Amino acid sequence: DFRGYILSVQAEEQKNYNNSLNGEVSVWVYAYYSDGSVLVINKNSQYKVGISETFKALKNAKPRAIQIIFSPSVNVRTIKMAKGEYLQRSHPWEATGIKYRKIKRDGEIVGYSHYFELPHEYNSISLAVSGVHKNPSSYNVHNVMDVFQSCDLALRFCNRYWAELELVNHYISPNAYPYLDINNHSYGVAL
Amino acid sequence: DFRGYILSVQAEEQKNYNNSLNGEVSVWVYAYYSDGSVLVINKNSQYKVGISETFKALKNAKPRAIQIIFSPSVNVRTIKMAKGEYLQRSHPWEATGIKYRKIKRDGEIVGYSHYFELPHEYNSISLAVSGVHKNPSSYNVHNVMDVFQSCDLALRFCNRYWAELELVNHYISPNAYPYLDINNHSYGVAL
Amino acid sequence: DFRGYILSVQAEEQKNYNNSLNGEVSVWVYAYYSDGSVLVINKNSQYKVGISETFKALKNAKPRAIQIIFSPSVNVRTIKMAKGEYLQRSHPWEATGIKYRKIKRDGEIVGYSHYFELPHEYNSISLAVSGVHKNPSSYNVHNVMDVFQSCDLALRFCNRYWAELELVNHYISPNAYPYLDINNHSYGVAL
C-alpha cells in the first residue's frame, strides 16, 4: 500500500521546509481577562517575528495573565520580552527562553509556551516579544533587503473569545495550533 | 522662448531624482466593497515600501476585489504578496510582479497595477504587499541604519470614498496619482 | 558617610549604561490642540527609535503646534523628520537636528526639543520622526538581527490630557521625563 509510504515522506518534506529559512515563525499572545474572556494576537512571518501591544481594560474586564506561544521553528535562545521602573534605569528587554515549556503531541514538539500571571494591582499591561527562526543561517545576513521585506509581509490577526472553551473549539482545534489550556491539556498536531 | 527649454530640463532632473535612491517608492491598495465604496491605503517611503492590513466587513458591505498600484520607481521583480491553508503548510509570500500591468499616459509609465477579484465566499481578506526601489544599488547595503530609519519615516494614509467616481475626482485626479478605473480608463501625469 | 560616595558612583554607572548601545533611545511627540488639550505619543527602543502618526481633528478640536523631544542618548545629527507638495516632487525627509534646543536641569542635558507651530489652515498633520543612538558603534552593524528584534520590542504609549497643567503634573513630573512647557519652564531630572 503506497498510500502509506507517500504520506510519511510528505511529512518529512514539510519538516525540512519548515526548518528552512523559507519556513515561517509564528507567535501568539494570549491575554486572559478577569471576566474569563481571552484575547489572542497572532503574527506570522519569515526570518523573525514579534508582537508589541498594550492590553487595556475592556468590556470593566481586566487582564490577569498572559501566555506567549511560539511555533517550533523559533530558536528559543533568541526570544526576548519587554514589559512596561523609571526610564533612566530600564533595560531594553530580558532573554526569557529558559521560561518556555515544550508543548508536545505524540512525543513531538508542537510549540513553546511561557505562561505568567499579572499582579492584581495591574489594570493594563504593555508587552513586546520577539524571536528569530532557528535555522543556522539566521545570523549570516540571503540579503538584508529580504529581511526588510519580511517585516512588511508579516500578517497580524486579533480575535477575542467569550471563554477559553470557545477559543479552544473555534480557534485552536480547527486551525491545528499549539496550545496549553487552563487544565494543562495540550493541543496541536504532530508532523 | 526659454520658458520652454527650462521646463523640459526640469522634468529630466525630476526623473533622475526619482530614479535615484533618494526617490520615494509608493504603494496604494484599493479595496472595492459590495456597496460600491472604495477603501484606499497609501504608503510612501524610501528604499522599499509595503502595506499589511485586514479588510473586514464595513458599514454589511463586504470587500469584493483589490487593486494594488506601485509607483514607477519600484522594481516589479521584487514585488511580493502574502494572503491569508493550514499554518504548517503555508509559503511566506508569492512573487507577483508578472501580474502587474503597466499604466501609461502619453506613452510613459506612470504606475503598475495588479487587479484581482475576491471569491464570493469571502467576508474579509488579510493582505500584505512589499516592493523595493529599482535603483541598481538597492541590493548593495548607503548604510543599513539609513534603511532602518526609512521604516520609521514611512507615512501612511487611509481614506474611504462613497463611489469610485468620487475617489477619481477627489483623490486620484487632484493628487496626480496613477490609476485604472472600472471602465479601464487610465489616470496619471507623465513627466 | 559612605551613603554619599556610593550614590555618586551609581549615577556615573547609569550614564555609562545609557551611553552604551544597551541604553534606550526615547522620543515623545506632543500635539497641542486648539481646545488646550495635549496628545502625547511616546516610543522607547534600543539602537534607534521613531514615531509615525496622523494627528487629526478630535473631540472639533484641531492641532495647532507640535513639540518633539528626544532623550539625551540620541545623536541629534541623525534626527530626520517627514511631513505630509505633489508626490512626483517630494523629498523623503529633512534633517532637522539643528532646530533642536537643549533642555537642561542643573547644567546637565536632560533632552532635546523641537517646537513648531502648524499653519492655521491645517485641520490635521501627518508626521514621522526618527533618531539613532549616539554611541559610536551605531553605524558599525552587534548583528543586524539584533536591530531587527529591537524594532519588534519597541513599546509605544499614547495618552491625552485635558490641559498642559495636567500633563505636567500627572505625566511629565511623576515619570521624571524631560519637557519644556508653554511658559518655557524646563522639567527633567539630572543624573
From Swiss-Prot, chains A, B, C:
Q: Which Pfam families match?
A: Cypo_polyhedrin
Species of origin = Bombyx mori cytoplasmic polyhedrosis virus
Q: Which GO terms describe its cellular component?
A: host cell cytoplasm; viral occlusion body
State the organism's lineage. Viruses, Riboviria, Orthornavirae, Duplornaviricota, Resentoviricetes
Q: Keyword annotations for this protein?
A: Glycoprotein, Host cytoplasm, Late protein, Signal, Viral occlusion body
Q: Please tell me what else the database record remarks about this protein.
A: The sequence of strain H is shown.
| Identification of the protein by name | Polyhedrin
Write down the InterPro entries for this protein, in alphabetical order.
Cypo_polyhedrin_Cypovirus1
| Localisation | Host cytoplasm
